[PDB]
Structure 1
Amino acid sequence: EDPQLLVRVRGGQLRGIRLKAPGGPVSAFLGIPFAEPPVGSRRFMPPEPKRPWSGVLDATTFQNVCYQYVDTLYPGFEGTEMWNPNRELSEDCLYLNVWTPYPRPASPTPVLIWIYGGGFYSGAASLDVYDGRFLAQVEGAVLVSMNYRVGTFGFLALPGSREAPGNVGLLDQRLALQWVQENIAAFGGDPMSVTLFGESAGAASVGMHILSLPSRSLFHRAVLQSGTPNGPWATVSAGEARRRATLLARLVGCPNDTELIACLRTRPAQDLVDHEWHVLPQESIFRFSFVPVVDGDFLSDTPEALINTGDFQDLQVLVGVVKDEGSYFLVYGVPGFSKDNESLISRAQFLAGVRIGVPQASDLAAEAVVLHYTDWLHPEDPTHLRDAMSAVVGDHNVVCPVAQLAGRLAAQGARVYAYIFEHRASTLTWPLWMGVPHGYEIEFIFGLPLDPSLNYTTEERIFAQRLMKYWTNFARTGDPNDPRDKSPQWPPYTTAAQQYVSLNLKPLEVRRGLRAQTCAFWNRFLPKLL
């Protein structure tokens, strides 16, 4: 009968579990329902608050992963499998997890809320790399992570209808935020200091909470790791969402919006998953069929309009990228790339790869990209063309949208801190040519190197500690710098000086201009070519 694993929330009692972290125990409350299961008639619909329960709800184990495509490109390969579901799939998946220190915090404690990535078609809060025990134990943080619907279940939209209004995965996330506001105090959390953090689609999601007014009253700070609400992949127009929904409907035999949606609700989850990739316009890496939609409700306008016209005076933001944002996506559909070769390519392959990675570029824009990224001392060298292909995809999808976001935010009142993450995990099983790929900073932020049984180096586990206190310092104060502190200071990102830091084994290094020229090419010149 451990009383600090017994907690009462607005819907009833829960029992958590005492977990062992390297430095001591933590309290974990796993699989807490925050919504009615979005099954049957609730499919495609906004989430409803979980109805109260009797007795003591067991909150000691992770719940089901939201129904989604499972990656099978490299079966049994750690590099891919580490991101695959580690619990069974279900549409009944709207649950969240809470990590707290053991015993529960003496005073109200800053809350970090993790929103996983996975292109809005995949992901889960139960993955090993999202383990909250280390941040909770070492930094005394309260950490919350929620599941949200992905793929069709989360983002299939027929805009204007009420059975499939779109953005319900974002609404799942928001409902979880509300749940934290109402209940986190019972766990020792401070509802008045809430920081959202996420990577990839999760970073984009965080951004969208920044740009959606009802969400704004549910947090105070934000961290966007390798993803943005603006850019080419995170959103679609209402018309295009309708088109894609209708196409998927016909691919599954369906058939008036009401009729079509009802027929879709009759379909088994796996039929929808089986067809969800056969709807997208062009051949494309870094591009997903069902994503947040500019609905004029959750998103009152396009993200770029909203970041261009928004007032972000009372917002603090931490943003950044890894060294090789594009590498990971080359092995997923660009001819000439694989995890097994060193993926050396010809310049014909490079041209074609540009056409793929940049599908809605005109012939002229595509050629502009090609010329801009060519090294004219070695325009035929296969290594240079490979790295260039990587840089094209990375810069276009992450680095330049991030640079633009940081610029707008800083220019319009926000306190911004920017980083580039440059350390390659010693335990990384992806080929060396992929450098520091997408998403491989996460394990360090969460403090996984603090676990001796994971075979990280010693420097990696000091590095991990550094990053944990950067992130938790930011949660606590809106500032990654240690308030009483020796390492160089991390200066705010501004439009004038454009300062950002390198995160690696060496001490903080301040640099200026986040790929300034290249991102001037992407954000200032290339738009003028349409």
Structure 2
Amino acid sequence: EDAELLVTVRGGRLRGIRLKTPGGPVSAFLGIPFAEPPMGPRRFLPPEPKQPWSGVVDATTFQSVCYQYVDTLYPGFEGTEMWNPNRELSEDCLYLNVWTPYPRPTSPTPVLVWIYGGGFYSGASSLDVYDGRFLVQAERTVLVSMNYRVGAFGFLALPGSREAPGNVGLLDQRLALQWVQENVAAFGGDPTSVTLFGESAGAASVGMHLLSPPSRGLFHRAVLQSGAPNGPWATVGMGEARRRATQLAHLVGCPNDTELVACLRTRPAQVLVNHEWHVLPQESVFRFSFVPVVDGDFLSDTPEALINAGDFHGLQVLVGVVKDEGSYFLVYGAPGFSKDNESLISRAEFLAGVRVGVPQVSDLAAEAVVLHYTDWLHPEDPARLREALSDVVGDHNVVCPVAQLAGRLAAQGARVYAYVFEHRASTLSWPLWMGVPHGYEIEFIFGIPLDPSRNYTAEEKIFAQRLMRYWANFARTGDPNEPRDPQWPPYTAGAQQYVSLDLRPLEVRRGLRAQACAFWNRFLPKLLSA
């Protein structure tokens, strides 16, 4: 028996497994229960801490994936399948995973906590693309990831009710973070040096923990990749949340909040999933049914209000986007789009696509969008229209919410570093017109190209090693920079400097789409108020 893979946490004893990497072994503890299973009467309720167990919990394999919609747009396609559940679905899914150097670090080591994205309706910590082994070996940090409830299970809210208070997926994340505070030293991690990082809804989650004081005491630094808590998709108001919960109930044959939730609780999980999409107020891309609700509890105000009121001295943040944030989402509902052709759309499809990509705004707002994203010298050029609709979707949903976060945080005392990730993976299976799509930096941050069984180039491996080093540096010191030789300067509201990440050395640039983002962040809200 190997003593290095036996660990005692507050709940009791665990047995881990030794994992191989090209750089040597790593210790992993996978499928550690951190909450009582949120099933039956516990569905929709805040997570309860896992009760202590006797004997040895087997932590050598990933646990179940939280019940969720499975994408079927392109059956068998790697582009989509890599994001689908790779373990059986279950409501008993509240487990977390710890990776640590082998042998276990005898002294306190910086801790990275990963929060996966997936629109708050999907995701899992067990996806290949999130394999923590390479980061931990190369950069000698402790790495933790958790599962959290998604979809109706994590975010159905009847606000004001005790039966479905909403935001429980976020509380799942908070519980995992408290778990880390209490137990991570037992794996050689330093609880006073926790960096949170996440992508998409993951990044939005990180941002929400930053703005929620009970969470804020649980970690030190933050990395938000291609996402922000101030997106137009990441939060919903109490009224709309109630409307969606009620309509879901109706669709699954349920009729008083108490009675409504009790009926929902009798329904097989798969039945809620089957109707989740149908509660959205319109056809759209980049909108999801059950998301964090602003109800004055977890978030005492909108993330944007909180961001402007905050003193952020003492916080360091790393934020960034990929070169083509919008392209991926277009094939999920914009007319004329497909991964299987050039998606060269007409003006009419462009005009219709705007209503789909910027849902639930007035006709006047839509016209303003059309005004800004139309090149009036070439108003009908199919290729330019394709790019422009991708920009609309990406700017509105990711880039401009990230720029605002970065600008406001910097202006209020945080030290911010910003990047644009510009390398298109040689292994990318999505078409060339999509460019560097959303989500495709993650495999580089996790050092996936170091896996020999995959088909990445020699240059891509070196690049991955550079990225792991920036991220780990940031986790350790609050500054991604290596000792002098081209330096990554902090992002400020004035100079607006960021760097491009790809195979060539850092290049410093100015403005995260400053012109477009003035439109979304400064003007459009005024227009919507009137």
TM-score bucket of the superposed structures, by smaller chain = over 0.9
Residue 192 in structure 1 maps to residue 153 in structure 2: no
Q: How does 1:451-462 map to 2 (within 5 A)?
A: 451-462=451-462
What's 2:90 paired with?
90
2: CA distance, partners of 1:117 / 1:326: 16
Q: How does 1:101-116 map to 2 (within 5 A)?
A: 101-116=101-116
What's 1:121 paired with?
121
Deviation at 1:376, TM superposition (A): 2.6
What's 1:251 paired with?
251
Q: TM-score, normalised by structure 1?
A: 0.99
**SS, match of residue 18 in structure 1:** strand
Aligned to 1:507, which of 505, 512, 522?
A: 505
Deviation at 1:430, TM superposition (A): 0.2
**SS, match of residue 324 in structure 2:** coil
Write the deviation string for residues 351-373 of structure 1: whole angstroms up to 9, x where unpaired.
00001101122112211111211
1: CA distance, partners of 2:297 / 2:365: 33
Q: How does 1:218-297 map to 2 (within 5 A)?
A: 218-297=218-297
**SS, match of residue 274 in structure 2:** helix
1: CA distance, partners of 2:214 / 2:171: 10
What's 2:493 paired with?
495
Deviation at 1:485, TM superposition (A): 5.0
What's 1:80 paired with?
80
What's 1:63 paired with?
63
Residue 306 in structure 1 maps to residue 306 in structure 2: yes
Deviation at 1:312, TM superposition (A): 1.1
1: CA distance, partners of 2:108 / 2:487: 28
Deviation at 1:513, TM superposition (A): 1.1
Aligned residues: 528
What's 1:138 paired with?
138
* 1:373 partner letter: Y
2: CA distance, partners of 1:141 / 1:44: 34
2: CA distance, partners of 1:106 / 1:513: 44
**SS, match of residue 27 in structure 1:** strand
What's 1:181 paired with?
181
2: CA distance, partners of 1:402 / 1:285: 19
Write the deviation string for residues 370-398 of structure 1: whole angstroms up to 9, x where unpaired.
12111233221111100101000000000
Q: How does 1:463-482 map to 2 (within 5 A)?
A: 463-482=463-482
Deviation at 1:528, TM superposition (A): 2.0
Write the deviation string for residues 130-169 of structure 1: whole angstroms up to 9, x where unpaired.
0000011111111000000000000000000111100000
* 1:108 partner letter: P
1: CA distance, partners of 2:468 / 2:132: 11
Which has the larger displacement, 41-50 or 253-262?
253-262
* 2:260 partner letter: L
* 2:19 partner letter: L
Q: TM-score, normalised by structure 2?
A: 0.99
Write the deviation string for residues 251-310 of structure 1: whole angstroms up to 9, x where unpaired.
111121111101110111011001111111011100001000001100111111100111
Which has the larger displacement, 107-116 or 366-375?
366-375
Residue 431 in structure 1 maps to residue 431 in structure 2: yes
* 1:356 partner letter: V
CA RMSD of aligned residues (A): 0.7
Residue 343 in structure 1 maps to residue 343 in structure 2: yes
Structure 1: runs of 5 or more not aligned: none
Write the deviation string for residues 146-201 of structure 1: whole angstroms up to 9, x where unpaired.
00000000000000011110000000000000000000000010001000000000
Q: How does 1:20-59 map to 2 (within 5 A)?
A: 20-59=20-59
Write the deviation string for residues 469-488 of structure 1: whole angstroms up to 9, x where unpaired.
00000000111012x453x1
1: CA distance, partners of 2:13 / 2:266: 35
1: CA distance, partners of 2:256 / 2:481: 56
1: CA distance, partners of 2:242 / 2:293: 10
**SS, match of residue 193 in structure 1:** strand
* 2:488 partner letter: W
1: CA distance, partners of 2:359 / 2:181: 42
**SS, match of residue 453 in structure 1:** coil
Residue 409 in structure 1 maps to residue 413 in structure 2: no
2: CA distance, partners of 1:203 / 1:517: 24
**SS, match of residue 359 in structure 1:** coil
* 1:131 partner letter: D
What's 1:516 paired with?
514
Residue 203 in structure 1 maps to residue 215 in structure 2: no
1: CA distance, partners of 2:129 / 2:396: 26
Residue 362 in structure 1 maps to residue 345 in structure 2: no
Deviation at 1:520, TM superposition (A): 0.5
**SS, match of residue 452 in structure 1:** coil
Deviation at 1:2, TM superposition (A): 0.5
Deviation at 1:89, TM superposition (A): 0.1
**SS, match of residue 384 in structure 1:** helix
1: CA distance, partners of 2:375 / 2:106: 58
Write the deviation string for residues 42-95 of structure 1: whole angstroms up to 9, x where unpaired.
000000000011111100000000000001111110000000000000000000
* 1:368 partner letter: A
2: CA distance, partners of 1:265 / 1:460: 48
2: CA distance, partners of 1:4 / 1:420: 40
2: CA distance, partners of 1:20 / 1:377: 57
Aligned to 1:529, which of 520, 527, 530?
A: 527
* 2:287 partner letter: R
2: CA distance, partners of 1:243 / 1:510: 46
* 1:295 partner letter: D
2: CA distance, partners of 1:440 / 1:513: 22
Write the deviation string for residues 87-129 of structure 1: whole angstroms up to 9, x where unpaired.
0000000000000011001211000000000000000000001
Q: How does 1:437-448 map to 2 (within 5 A)?
A: 437-448=437-448
Where has structure 1 moved over 4 Å in runs of 4 or more? Answer: none
Which has the larger displacement, 430-439 or 249-258?
249-258
What's 2:18 paired with?
18
* 1:55 partner letter: G
Write the deviation string for residues 471-517 of structure 1: whole angstroms up to 9, x where unpaired.
000000111012x453x111111112111100011100101111111
2: CA distance, partners of 1:314 / 1:291: 29
* 1:493 partner letter: Y
1: CA distance, partners of 2:435 / 2:95: 35
